[PDB]
RNA sequence: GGGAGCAAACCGGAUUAGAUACCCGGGUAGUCCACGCCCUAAACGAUGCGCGCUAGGUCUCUGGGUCUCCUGGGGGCCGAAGCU
RNA sequence: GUAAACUCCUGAACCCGGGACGAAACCCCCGACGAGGGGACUGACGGUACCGGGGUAAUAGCGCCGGCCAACUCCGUGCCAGCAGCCGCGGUAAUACGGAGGGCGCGAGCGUUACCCGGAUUCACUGGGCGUAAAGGGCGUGUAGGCGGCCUGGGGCGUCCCAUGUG
């Protein structure tokens, strides 16, 4: 059991002599507010199914987020496809300044205080996949010196 | 300003029971108990997934209405706190608290914040000796908040201090219950408070 | 571009051209009517919108939208103009203001009232 | 003809690291050695050495990489994720001590030529001096 | 103090006067790149002793005429026709820019 | 200046509702030479120039070797990393 | 919708009484016409602020509620009459027009129009690009200009640091 919040839900539409046939997406974050989140994209012929399914994939695909208080260690910029996101650390009393997508993710990763800006394509699906991969590149001086031994 | 009109109806709507009336929004009937939904034709209906916005909005209004204060003035305080070092949340509440009419409430003198106002603006309070009638007055450390001489002889103040004998004031606040004095002791730390408000969402409402 | 290009060429700033020559960088304009016509809408629509050609104090003269239902303007009505197109009557790029000079407000209208310039009623 | 040695040096490093190259050479220059001397000290490389190819001086650079990982693509994470030239030859860059950057929040480093030899964000900052920002490393 | 500059005699062809070309470097205030940008100054050579191409220092003075507010201080070094070429030729290319 | 062949225009026959076309029979510039203009183009790899660096496989043109092969220059195909 | 009525309690306005700070110098006396000491004149704002006594429940408006964007239902209407910031709404069951009931926002204000910055990393230094999206010059030759392999010293203009004037 993690918080679980769902970000967007759409109805795509394929064609077949007879008309269009619809399929649904639900792009969902799930997290404990402790440093553990995951992004799950589920698709399926009905709404509650996809979202339910997205949850399954979300716990499948998770990542461990190094915090201090409730913020990121350092800054990173991540381009995914054409979509681009900028994470920068901020001090207590700030809050999460972001759109509903990247927000949803950082809230459930137990972050209070963090700055963003979405450049590039603002496409939620790709903005999402960009933010994960960002977290996936985070580090503490521990991770750093463990690498620069020699 | 200062709202006016239907109240234990915002005790509603937000649906998190505001003690706007004072005693009544305590009885088995802030009307919150007997009608637990939003006012007007709909109220009881399939509630719909509120937008991020709707949340942030509904969280700030909640807080604002507690103190009952014009958005203008509320906004002013917010910015004051923003351009100030310290956790902006904390700070903001301090400044909100540090208002006279609210101290008057939080030292007991008055049942409701809206009653606590009427007293203030009728000179029935006094500070460090000298009498004051400005609700927005910000009280500072070491400040005797008495009751003016011609106000000491009044039913209302007695009954309100009556139920205050023995009961507990903020950790940042004192109260000479006999002599109807009492002091602001410090700026209240976030934890001291208990309001039904994730103050962080208010900080976020104003980032828009 | 290289940096050395910018040094010579520089970056060129756009600057805008006003959707509305009420001239003078003015908020408003006094006008005199010349034609009070009933024109027809653009693509997906169908109606008969009330418009007026109008001599401005600018020496200009344009088609302006007449709001509301039922109006009271003739060949020579003095009028005040507002700015605001009507994506539907191409080249109507200004609105007439109601309840101003020979333009009289909308009678029997209670709702959105300051727009449409109508006095507060007491309905008894 | 190479317009900037340095920027190519860094690149060759950026380029060698990408394929996990055990070592990689780079034509020599005292100023380069000075650079590489900080790269090793700061733990970005095992190190380097003066070498010879057809009489011509090179510097074999011994690269350092992460540990092998599991999951698909086991390729070890890097010691040098990103290395980028700053004061290029067309667009030179200079900074007084007060104006120096804090790379990656301090996890990474900014290298820089100053009248007192090649230094780093902390060193220079501490020395109380500035000069040509060379490049950023993390 | 009376400002001093160092430049090249490009024109000797006035009675007791010379033209000194002074470049100066400074960083572009947006693009950093360091840019060169020169200026011709008319200097007083009262003993027509400085010939063409000589590199010289020029001091800020009280007005000598319209245009002339400087005096030749001293010779730094002689005969620099290569720099004058840059000048003449860059000025010679202007003949190629008309219509 | 040249003019065999081909051929805009142009004319005849066809087809077609119509046929200023498509198909057929002719046919003038032009196509060619010289000399001088003109300066365009899907002037296309729709990919500016120079340099350094980053798996290889396959066939081909052209050179050099104490020539099952090694090396240099050029032309194609499949593709590491990476980019899109 | 506790909203009202209703029940008390307060007392904005109004009412009566008192009533300035700003004004101590110049000047007049002792001292020397000086330093020092002392004495008198003067208020437009104004009988206002403010203090004291008394004391009446005593203005609410404007925009919006299809999405963006917070706030839904009936009636009227029937591609009409109308709306509109952009997508769009109205062709007989309209949450989009008009009225109504309710509701959201702000409040002695609330709306509109105009104009500046922002959002616009949409002239991009920070911070964009040009195979097919808008973008490689048809191709050369080279002028000005931009840029410049390895090593050693001289200078120290760029560059960095220190003090100080100015700011």
Residues B74, B95: Cα–Cα separation, whole Å:
10
CA-nearest of E8, E13, E12, E4 to E79 is E8
Q: Dihedral (C-alpha) B40, B42, B47, B50: value to the nearest 10 degrees? A: -50
- C42 CA vs G30 C1’ separation (Å): 102
Residues E53, E10: Cα–Cα separation, whole Å:
6
Q: Is the CB of C43 under 7 A from strand G?
A: no
- Give B40: exposed, middle or buried? Use CB within 10 Å, 0-12, 13-18, 19+: exposed
Structure tokens at B96: 């909100």
Q: Which nucleotide lies closest to D16 by the C1' atom and the CA atom?
A: F54
Angle between helices D30-41 and D5-18 in degrees, nearest 10: 40
Angle between helices B71-82 and B88-97 in degrees, nearest 10: 130
Pick the residue of E27, E30, E36, E37 with the most C CBs within 10 A to test the interface with C by mutation.
E30
Residues B107, B125: Cα–Cα separation, whole Å:
12
Contact yes or no for E45/E15 (Cβ under 8 A):
no
Residues D62, D79: Cα–Cα separation, whole Å:
12
Structure tokens at C91: 């080249």
Helix (H) or strand (E) holding C34: strand C29-39
Residues B174, B181: Cα–Cα separation, whole Å:
9
Contact residues, chain D, for C3 at CB < 8 Å: 90-91
Task: For residue C36, give every residue at least 6 positions away whose Cβ sits within 8 Å of its Cβ, in sequence order, or none.
Answer: C50, C51, C52, C66, C73, C74, C75, C77
Q: Is the CB of C84 under 7 A from strand G?
A: yes
Length reported for chain A: 150
Strand G bases within 7 angstroms of protein beta carbons: 1-3, 9-12, 51-53, 61-64, 68-73, 79-91, 98-116, 121, 123-125, 128-130, 143-152, 157-162
Which CATH architecture does the domain made up of D81-138 adopt? 2-Layer Sandwich (3.30)
Helix (H) or strand (E) holding C85: none
Structure tokens at B203: 């900080």
CB-based contacts of D5-13 (< 8 A; 24+ apart in sequence) = D5/D29, D5/D32, D6/D31, D6/D32, D6/D35, D6/D85, D6/D134, D6/D135, D7/D85, D7/D88, D7/D89, D9/D35, D10/D83, D10/D84, D10/D85, D10/D135, D11/D85, D13/D61, D13/D63, D13/D80, D13/D83
**H runs (alpha helix) in chain D:** 5-18, 30-41, 121-127
CA-nearest of C17, C23, C42, C41 to C81 is C23
A29 and A70: one domain? Answer: no
Look-up: residue for tokens 């009498």?
B131
CA-nearest of B176, B122, B125, B133 to B149 is B125
For residue A62, what are the CA distances in angstroms to A38, A40, A99, A142, D28?
A: 4, 9, 21, 21, 46
Q: Which nucleotide lies closest to E24 by the C1' atom and the CA atom?
A: G157
The residue of chain D with its CA nearest to that of C6 is: D91
User: Per-domain residue ranges for chain D?
Assistant: 3-80, 81-138
Q: Which of D46, D81, D107 sits opposite A150 (nearest CB)?
A: D46
Domain of C50? 1-124
Task: For residue B73, give every residue at least 6 positions away whose Cβ sits within 8 Å of its Cβ, in sequence order, or none.
Answer: B1, B136
Footprint of strand F on the protein (CB under 7 A): A 79, 82; D 1-3, 8, 11-12, 15-16, 18-19, 21, 24
CA-nearest of E26, E25, E40 to E88 is E40
Contact yes or no for A40/A54 (Cβ under 8 A):
yes
Q: Which residue is nearest to nucleotide G124 (CA to C1')?
A: C11
Q: SS3 of B207, please?
A: coil
The total number of structural domains that make up chain C: 1
Residues of chain A whose C-beta is under 8 A from some C-beta in B? 92-97, 100, 103, 112
Structure tokens at B79: 């910015």
Look-up: residue for tokens 């410090």?
B186
Domains of chain B: 1-96+194-208 (1.10.1050.10), 97-193 (3.10.290.10)
DSSP-assigned letter for residue B103: H
Residues C75, D97: Cα–Cα separation, whole Å:
76
The total number of structural domains that make up chain E: 1
The total number of structural domains that make up chain A: 2
Q: From the CA of A89, how many Å to the nearest CA of chain D?
A: 9
Q: Which nucleotide lies closest to D73 by the C1' atom and the CA atom?
A: F81
Q: Which of B52, B87, B204 sits opposite A92 (nearest CB)?
A: B87
Contact residues, chain E, for C4 at CB < 8 Å: 33
Report angle CA C109, C27, C36 to the nearest 5 degrees: 55
Q: SS3 of B193, please?
A: coil
Structure tokens at C109: 């209208």
- Give B106: exposed, middle or buried? Use CB within 10 Å, 0-12, 13-18, 19+: buried
DSSP-assigned letter for residue B173: B
Q: Binding site residues of B, as ranges?
A: 8, 11, 25, 30
Distance of alpha carbon A143 from the chain centroid: 22
Rg over alpha carbons for chain A, rounded to the nearest Å, is 17
Q: Which of A92, A93, A95 sits opposite B204 (nearest CB)?
A: A95
A70 and A86: one domain? Answer: yes
A45 and A81: one domain? Answer: no
The string of DSSP codes covering E52-78 is TT-EEEEEE-S-SSSS--EEEEEEEE-
Task: For residue B79, give every residue at least 6 positions away whose Cβ sits within 8 Å of its Cβ, in sequence order, or none.
Answer: none
Which CATH architecture does the domain made up of D3-80 adopt? 2-Layer Sandwich (3.30)
Q: Which residue is nearest to nucleotide G156 (CA to C1')?
A: D115
A40 and A94: one domain? Answer: no
Q: Encode E1-24 in three state secondary structure.
A: CCCEEEEEEEEEEECCEEEEEECC
Report angle CA C45, C46, C47 to the nearest 5 degrees: 125
Task: For residue D55, give every residue at least 6 positions away whose Cβ sits within 8 Å of its Cβ, in sequence order, or none.
Answer: none
Domain of A130? 63-148
CATH number at residue A122: 3.30.230.10
CATH number at residue C94: 2.40.50.140
Q: SS3 of D18, please?
A: helix
Pick the residue of E28, E33, E35, E36 with the most D CBs within 10 A to test the interface with D by mutation.
E33
- Give A37: exposed, middle or buried? Use CB within 10 Å, 0-12, 13-18, 19+: buried
A28 and A100: one domain? Answer: no
Pick the residue of D87, D88, D91 with the most E CBs within 10 A to test the interface with E by mutation.
D91
The string of DSSP codes covering chain A is ----EEEEEEEEEEEETTEEEEEEEEEEEEE-SSSEEEEEEEEESSHHHHHHHHHHHHHHSEEE---BTTB-SS-EEEEETTEEEEEEE--TT--EES-HHHHHHHHHTT--SEEEEEEEB--HHHHHHHHHHHHTT---HHHHHHHS--
A89 and A30: one domain? Answer: no
For residue A80, what are the CA distances in angstroms to A129, A136, C13?
A: 7, 13, 31
Structure tokens at D9: 């040096």
CB-based contacts of A11-20 (< 8 A; 24+ apart in sequence) = A12/A43
Question: Which chains sit next to E, with 3 or more Cβ pairs under 8 A?
Answer: C, D
CA-nearest of D132, D136, C7 to E33 is C7
- Give A65: exposed, middle or buried? Use CB within 10 Å, 0-12, 13-18, 19+: buried
Q: Which of D42, D44, D107 sits opposite A74 (nearest CB)?
A: D107
Contact D104 A74 (CB under 8 A): yes
E strand segments, chain D:
23-24, 45-53, 56-63, 83-85, 94-95, 109-114, 117-120, 131-137
Q: Which nucleotide lies closest to D15 by the C1' atom and the CA atom?
A: F54
CA-nearest of C4, C17, C20, C10 to C93 is C20
Residue B200 phi/psi, 5° resolution? -60, -35
Residue B159 phi/psi, 5° resolution? -55, -35
A96 and A34: one domain? Answer: no
Strand F bases within 7 angstroms of protein beta carbons: 50-55, 80-82, 84
Identical fold, D3-80 and D81-138: no
Among A62, A77, A92, the domain boundary falls at: A62
Residues D79, D109: Cα–Cα separation, whole Å:
13
A17 and A33: one domain? Answer: yes
D84 CB neighbour count, 10 Å cutoff: 12
Tell me the sheet residues that pair with B126: B131, B146
Residues B120, B132: Cα–Cα separation, whole Å:
7
CA-nearest of A132, A131, A104 to A117 is A131
Residues A32, A80: Cα–Cα separation, whole Å:
25
Do E and A make contact via 3 or more CB pairs under 8 A? The reply is no
Contact yes or no for B108/B175 (Cβ under 8 A):
yes
Q: SS3 of B55, please?
A: helix
Contact yes or no for D36/D16 (Cβ under 8 A):
no
Q: SS3 of B156, please?
A: helix
Q: Which nucleotide lies closest to D21 by the C1' atom and the CA atom?
A: F54
Strand arrangement, sheet containing A114-120:
A76-80, A83-89, A114-120, A96-97
**H runs (alpha helix) in D54-120:** none
Residues C49, B55: Cα–Cα separation, whole Å:
42
Q: Is the CB of C50 under 7 A from strand G?
A: yes
Helix (H) or strand (E) holding B176: none
Q: Dihedral (C-alpha) B30, B35, B37, B39: value to the nearest 10 degrees? A: -80
Q: SS3 of D91, please?
A: coil
A6 CB neighbour count, 10 Å cutoff: 19
Contact yes or no for B59/B44 (Cβ under 8 A):
no
- Find residues 55-114 of chain D whose CB sits inside 8 Å of chain C: 90-91
Domain of E93? 1-99
Handedness of CA C47, C48, C53, C57 (dihedral sign): negative
């Amino acid at each position: 059991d993690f918080e679980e919040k769902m970000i967007l839900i759409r109805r795509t539409a394929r064609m077949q002599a007879g008309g269009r046939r619809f399929r649904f997406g639900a792009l969902v974050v799930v997290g404990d507010r402790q440093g553990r989140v995951g992004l799950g994209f589920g698709k399926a012929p009905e709404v509650p199914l996809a979202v339910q399914k997205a949850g399954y994939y979300a716990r499948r695909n998770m990542v461990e987020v190094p915090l201090q208080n409730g913020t990121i260690p350092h800054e990173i910029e991540v381009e995914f496809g054409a979509s681009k996101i900028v994470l920068k650390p901020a001090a207590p009393g700030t809050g999460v300044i972001a759109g509903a997508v990247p927000r949803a993710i950082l809230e459930l990763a137990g972050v209070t205080d963090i700055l963003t800006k979405e450049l590039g394509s603002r496409n939620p699906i790709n903005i999402a996949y960009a933010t994960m991969e960002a977290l996936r590149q985070l580090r503490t001086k521990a991770d750093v010196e463990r690498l620069r031994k020699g | 300003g200062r709202y006016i009109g239907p109240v234990c109806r915002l005790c509603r709507r937000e649906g998190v029971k505001l003690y706007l009336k004072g005693e009544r929004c305590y009885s088995p009937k802030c009307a919150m108990e007997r009608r637990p939904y939003p006012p007007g034709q709909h109220g009881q209906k399939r509630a719909r997934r509120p937008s991020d916005y709707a949340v942030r909005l509904r969280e700030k209004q909640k807080l604002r209405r507690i103190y009952g204060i014009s958005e203008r003035q509320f906004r002013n305080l917010f910015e004051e706190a923003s351009k100030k070092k310290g956790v902006t949340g904390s700070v903001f509440l301090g400044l909100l608290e540090s208002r006279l009419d609210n101290v008057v409430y939080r030292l007991g003198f008055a049942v409701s914040r809206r009653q606590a106002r009427q007293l203030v603006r009728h000179g029935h309070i006094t500070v460090n000796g000298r009498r004051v009638d400005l609700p927005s007055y910000r009280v500072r450390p070491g400040d005797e908040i008495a009751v003016a001489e011609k106000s000491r002889n009044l039913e209302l103040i007695r009954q309100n201090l009556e139920a205050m004998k023995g009961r507990k004031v903020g950790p940042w606040l004192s109260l000479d219950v006999e002599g109807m004095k009492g002091k602001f002791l410090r700026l209240p730390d976030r934890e001291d408070l208990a309001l039904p408000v994730n103050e962080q969402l208010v900080i976020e409402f104003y980032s828009r | 571009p290289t940096i050395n290009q910018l040094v010579r060429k520089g970056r060129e700033k756009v600057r805008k051209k006003s959707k509305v020559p009420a001239l003078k960088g003015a908020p408003f304009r006094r006008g005199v009517c010349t034609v009070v016509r009933t024109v027809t809408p653009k693509k997906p629509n169908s109606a008969l919108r009330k418009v007026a050609k109008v001599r401005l104090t600018s020496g200009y003269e344009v088609t302006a939208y007449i709001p509301g239902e039922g109006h009271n303007l003739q060949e020579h009505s003095v009028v005040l103009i507002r700015g605001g197109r009507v994506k539907d009557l191409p080249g109507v790029r200004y609105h007439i203001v109601r309840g101003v000079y020979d333009a009289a407000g909308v009678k029997d209208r209670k709702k959105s009232r300051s727009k449409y310039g109508t006095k507060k009623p007491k309905e008894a | 003809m190479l317009t900037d040695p340095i920027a190519d040096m860094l690149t060759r490093i950026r380029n060698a690291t990408r394929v996990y190259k055990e070592s990689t050479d780079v034509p020599a220059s005292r100023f380069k050695e000075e650079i590489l001397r900080i790269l090793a000290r700061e733990g970005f490389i095992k190190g380097y050495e003066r070498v010879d190819v057809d009489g011509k001086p090179y510097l074999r650079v011994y690269l350092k990489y992460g540990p092998r990982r599991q999951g698909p693509d086991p390729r070890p994470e890097q010691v040098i994720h990103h290395i980028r030239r700053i004061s290029k030859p067309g667009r030179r860059v200079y900074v007084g001590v007060k104006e120096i950057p804090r790379v990656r929040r301090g996890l990474g480093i900014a290298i820089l030529s100053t009248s007192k030899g090649v230094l780093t964000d902390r060193e220079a900052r501490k020395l109380g001096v500035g000069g040509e920002l060379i490049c950023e490393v993390w | 103090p009376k400002k001093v500059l160092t430049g090249v005699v490009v024109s000797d062809k006035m009675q007791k006067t010379v033209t000194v070309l002074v470049e100066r470097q400074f960083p572009h205030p947006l693009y950093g790149k360091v840019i060169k940008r020169s200026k011709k100054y008319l200097a007083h050579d009262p003993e027509e002793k400085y010939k063409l191409g000589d590199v010289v220092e020029i001091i800020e003075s009280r007005p000598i005429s319209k245009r002339k507010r400087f005096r030749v201080l001293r010779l730094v070094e002689s005969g620099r026709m290569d720099l004058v070429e840059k000048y003449l030729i860059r000025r010679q290319n202007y003949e190629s820019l008309s219509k």
